Amino acid sequence: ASLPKRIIKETEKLVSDPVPGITAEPHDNLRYFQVTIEGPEQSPYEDGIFELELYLPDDYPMEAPKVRFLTKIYHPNIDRLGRIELDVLKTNWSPALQIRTVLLSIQALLASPNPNDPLANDVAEDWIKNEQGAKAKAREWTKLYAKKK
């Protein structure tokens, strides 16, 4: 019946105290957010701004926020449907964490692709053995799909 005070407080901090490089705004329903993350400087994603959707389930904060890239990205730990492989969005999520924590983790993942992760997707071998080609493809997909800075 009433929107939880915790969601109201987190939203207020996201809009009034943004994480550097990250924007997060409600899409009047405070369970749906439009997020942007700047491609980290000196990463292959540096010339783009990536768009993401974030949803707070009815059982938030016991249930993790659901986050997905809208922007198609070439990365070993994010699939071609924009699903993010992070422990902080799965088994390490707890109510002691916040939305800003997940967003900081996703930004850090863009700066630190980990093709050795046992869950890394099928671009990982190219990333490890043909790093120049893989980074060029990540830069190309930034150009094709991301918003420009």
Side-chain angles (χ1 to χ4, degrees), residues 1-4 6-33 35-65 67-89 91-136 138-147 149:
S2 46
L3 203 260
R6 147 124 189 197
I7 296 175
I8 304 164
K9 290 179 62 181
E10 286 198 65
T11 304
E12 200 289 313
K13 291 307 197 208
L14 283 176
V15 303
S16 82
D17 188 26
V19 173
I22 305 186
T23 312
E25 67 194 354
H27 199 295
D28 316 319
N29 184 322
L30 253 53
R31 297 195 175 262
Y32 289 87
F33 291 73
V35 170
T36 71
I37 304 176
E38 288 183 0
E41 184 157 6
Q42 311 204 316
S43 82
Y45 313 106
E46 72 184 344
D47 289 317
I49 303 291
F50 294 82
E51 296 175 291
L52 297 93
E53 57 186 6
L54 184 147
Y55 170 61
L56 301 186
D58 285 327
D59 293 332
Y60 186 82
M62 278 189 288
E63 194 186 330
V67 193
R68 193 183 71 82
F69 281 80
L70 298 165
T71 307
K72 184 163 184 166
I73 188 168
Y74 190 80
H75 185 118
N77 315 290
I78 302 155
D79 75 17
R80 261 58 74 187
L81 297 89
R83 180 175 170 284
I84 303 156
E85 204 70 77
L86 283 172
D87 289 344
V88 77
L89 285 165
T91 68
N92 287 171
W93 173 265
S94 79
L97 300 187
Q98 296 203 288
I99 299 160
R100 126 171 8 234
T101 312
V102 167
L103 299 182
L104 282 162
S105 292
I106 298 164
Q107 179 176 235
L109 181 63
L110 292 180
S112 191
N114 183 11
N116 288 142
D117 192 289
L119 296 178
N121 66 54
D122 66 12
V123 306
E125 193 188 21
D126 190 56
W127 212 287
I128 295 162
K129 289 184 185 198
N130 182 30
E131 66 191 73
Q132 197 185 355
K135 294 187 185 177
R139 190 173 297 273
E140 182 187 5
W141 288 32
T142 300
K143 173 186 72 175
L144 295 174
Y145 305 124
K147 300 314 196 51
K149 290 194 180 167

